[PDB]
Design a protein around this motif. Structure first.
Motif, short mmCIF file in Angstrom:
data_model
loop_
_atom_site.label_atom_id
_atom_site.label_comp_id
_atom_site.label_asym_id
_atom_site.label_seq_id
_atom_site.Cartn_x
_atom_site.Cartn_y
_atom_site.Cartn_z
N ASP A 19 -5.42 -2.77 5.56
CA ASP A 19 -3.62 -3.08 4.46
C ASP A 19 -3.64 -3.42 3.47
O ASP A 19 -2.63 -3.67 2.93
CB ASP A 19 -3.36 -4.01 6.25
CG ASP A 19 -1.92 -4.60 5.48
OD1 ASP A 19 -1.01 -4.32 4.86
OD2 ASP A 19 -2.08 -5.81 5.66
N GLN A 20 -5.18 -4.48 3.47
CA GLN A 20 -5.59 -4.63 1.94
C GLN A 20 -6.01 -3.46 1.23
O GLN A 20 -5.20 -4.17 0.09
CB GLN A 20 -6.51 -6.36 1.95
CG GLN A 20 -6.85 -7.41 0.70
CD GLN A 20 -5.68 -8.36 0.98
OE1 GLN A 20 -4.65 -8.71 1.58
NE2 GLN A 20 -5.21 -8.28 -0.90
N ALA A 21 -6.41 -2.97 1.48
CA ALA A 21 -7.02 -1.98 0.72
C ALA A 21 -6.08 -1.49 -0.52
O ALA A 21 -5.51 -0.92 -1.65
CB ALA A 21 -8.07 -1.50 0.81
N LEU A 22 -4.70 -1.07 0.70
CA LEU A 22 -3.50 -0.20 0.33
C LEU A 22 -2.67 -1.36 -0.79
O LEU A 22 -2.52 -0.08 -1.16
CB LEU A 22 -3.13 0.15 1.48
CG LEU A 22 -3.60 0.51 2.48
CD1 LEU A 22 -2.56 1.31 3.80
CD2 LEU A 22 -3.61 2.74 1.83
N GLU A 23 -2.16 -2.57 -0.20
CA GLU A 23 -1.69 -3.32 -1.26
C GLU A 23 -1.92 -3.06 -2.34
O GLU A 23 -1.75 -3.16 -3.41
CB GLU A 23 -1.87 -4.67 -0.36
CG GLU A 23 -0.91 -5.97 -0.97
CD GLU A 23 0.51 -5.49 -0.60
OE1 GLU A 23 0.68 -4.47 -0.13
OE2 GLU A 23 1.96 -5.61 -1.22
N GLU A 24 -3.64 -3.21 -2.17
CA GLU A 24 -4.38 -3.36 -4.05
C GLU A 24 -4.48 -2.34 -4.40
O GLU A 24 -3.63 -2.01 -5.29
CB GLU A 24 -6.04 -4.37 -3.79
CG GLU A 24 -5.92 -5.61 -3.14
CD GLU A 24 -7.18 -6.22 -3.04
OE1 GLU A 24 -8.44 -5.41 -3.41
OE2 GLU A 24 -7.57 -6.95 -2.18
N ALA A 25 -4.49 -1.20 -4.01
CA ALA A 25 -4.43 -0.06 -4.82
C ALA A 25 -3.25 0.22 -5.42
O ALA A 25 -3.27 0.66 -6.53
CB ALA A 25 -4.97 1.33 -3.54
N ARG A 26 -1.85 -0.29 -4.39
CA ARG A 26 -0.76 -0.01 -4.94
C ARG A 26 -0.14 -0.58 -6.41
O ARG A 26 0.75 -0.75 -7.81
CB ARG A 26 0.90 0.34 -3.93
CG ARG A 26 0.60 1.62 -3.32
CD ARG A 26 2.23 1.19 -2.73
NE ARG A 26 3.00 1.98 -3.97
CZ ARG A 26 3.93 0.69 -4.39
NH1 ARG A 26 3.66 0.08 -3.44
NH2 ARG A 26 4.73 1.20 -5.07
N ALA A 27 -1.30 -2.02 -6.10
CA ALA A 27 -0.48 -3.21 -6.81
C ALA A 27 -1.35 -2.49 -8.07
O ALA A 27 -1.02 -2.98 -9.74
CB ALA A 27 -0.91 -4.95 -6.92
N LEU A 28 -2.72 -1.82 -8.25
CA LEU A 28 -3.26 -1.83 -9.48
C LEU A 28 -2.64 -0.21 -10.17
O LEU A 28 -2.69 0.10 -11.20
CB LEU A 28 -4.37 -0.95 -8.84
CG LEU A 28 -5.73 -1.02 -10.16
CD1 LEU A 28 -5.42 -2.55 -11.21
CD2 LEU A 28 -7.29 -1.06 -9.55
N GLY A 29 -1.56 0.06 -9.41
CA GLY A 29 -0.89 1.77 -9.36
C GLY A 29 -1.92 2.78 -9.54
O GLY A 29 -1.69 3.79 -10.19
N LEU A 30 -2.35 2.63 -8.57
CA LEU A 30 -3.61 3.81 -8.24
C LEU A 30 -2.67 5.23 -7.07
O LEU A 30 -2.19 4.81 -6.58
CB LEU A 30 -5.12 3.67 -7.25
CG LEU A 30 -6.09 2.69 -8.23
CD1 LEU A 30 -7.27 2.36 -7.20
CD2 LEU A 30 -6.49 2.62 -9.79
N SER A 31 -3.09 5.94 -7.39
CA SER A 31 -2.16 7.68 -6.96
C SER A 31 -3.51 7.72 -5.27
O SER A 31 -3.02 8.42 -4.69
CB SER A 31 -2.98 8.75 -7.74
OG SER A 31 -3.84 9.21 -7.89
N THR A 32 -4.86 7.26 -5.48
CA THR A 32 -5.64 8.03 -4.28
C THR A 32 -6.33 6.76 -3.58
O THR A 32 -6.56 5.80 -4.83
CB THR A 32 -6.38 8.55 -5.11
OG1 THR A 32 -5.64 9.81 -5.14
CG2 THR A 32 -7.29 9.56 -3.54
N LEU A 33 -6.68 6.72 -2.47
CA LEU A 33 -7.95 5.53 -2.59
C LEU A 33 -8.98 5.70 -1.35
O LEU A 33 -8.37 6.65 -0.21
CB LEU A 33 -7.10 4.21 -2.36
CG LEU A 33 -7.39 3.19 -0.55
CD1 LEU A 33 -8.48 2.44 -1.71
CD2 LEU A 33 -6.45 2.76 0.59
#
Length: 80
Positions: A19-33
């Motif tokens: 949940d945290q990693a998805l939040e951070e990945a979207r916050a950073l503007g990443l396309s993939t995790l």
């Protein structure tokens, strides 16, 4: 590609971190995790995949191909 190592966590700890990693990945503007959960009992893989199905931050997900983690890594395409 951003990768989070969830191996060694319980299902509950792993899902909290996802949940945290998805939040951070979207916050950073990443396309993939990449979610490195490992194989083992499969309990992490199964629980994570089901959580991702329900997660509105996720466009799609799949096991990594052989040689890039296989079924020990879930590769997540994020919504922009």
């Amino acid at each position: 590609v951003k990768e989070v190592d969830l191996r060694g966590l319980t299902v509950a700890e792993a899902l909290l971190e996802v949940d945290q990693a998805l939040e951070e990945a979207r916050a950073l503007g990443l396309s993939t995790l990449r979610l490195l959960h490992g194989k083992g009992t499969g309990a992490l893989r199964q629980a994570i995949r089901e959580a991702l199905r329900r997660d509105k931050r996720v466009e799609s997900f799949a096991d990594a191909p052989p040689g890039e983690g296989g079924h020990g890594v879930t590769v997540v395409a994020l919504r922009p």
